[PDB]
Design a protein around this nucleic acid. Structure first.
Ligand SMILES: [K+]
Ligand SMILES: [K+]
Ligand SMILES: [K+]
Ligand SMILES: [K+]
Ligand SMILES: [K+]
Ligand SMILES: [K+]
Ligand SMILES: [Mg+2]
Ligand SMILES: [Mg+2]
Ligand SMILES: [Mg+2]
Ligand SMILES: [Mg+2]
Length: 80
RNA sequence: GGGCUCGAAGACGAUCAGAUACCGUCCUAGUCUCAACCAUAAACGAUGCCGACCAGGGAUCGGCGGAUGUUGCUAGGAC
């Protein structure tokens, strides 16, 4: 048994989706979220910080009284 | 002292209205070196020297520290 917590399952899903795979370059202001660099050169993102930031963004979004005042847009085809 | 080459000056051949030029041909000084002078250049980064702070990134030269795997090589060298 040992049912996983919400954070556990969320991070498992993120790993399944490869959310933790960065690029070969790191922005100096994104370094605080990167865990370490692998021998290949791809930076590994700290999924705990990603989950915490997702929770923080949800906290910010929920406080908007009218959801119609929020606009979400994606330039790339994948995120549309 | 050297004097190959190129080549101020000079002399010719062209072009041109003229052509003391640009183009072509032959050449003196010079161009090289030694001894002694000269002390000037858009001698430019058109940007004094010393010292402190001040964003990010990838390359590159020299030295050094660490890790790691190869080398038709001799712990080292190359990566
Ligand atoms: K000569
Ligand atoms: K001459
Ligand atoms: K003329
Ligand atoms: K002089
Ligand atoms: K200059
Ligand atoms: K450097
Ligand atoms: Mg001659
Ligand atoms: Mg001389
Ligand atoms: Mg002067
Ligand atoms: Mg070096």
């Amino acid at each position: 048994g040992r049912t996983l917590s919400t954070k556990e399952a969320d991070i498992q899903m993120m790993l399944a989706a490869e959310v933790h795979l960065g690029t070969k370059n790191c922005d100096f202001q994104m370094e605080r979220y990167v865990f370490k660099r692998r021998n290949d050169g791809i930076y590994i993102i700290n999924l705990g910080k990603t989950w915490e930031k997702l929770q923080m963004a949800a906290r910010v979004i929920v406080a908007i009284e009218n959801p119609k005042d929020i606009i979400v847009q994606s330039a790339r085809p994948y995120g549309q």
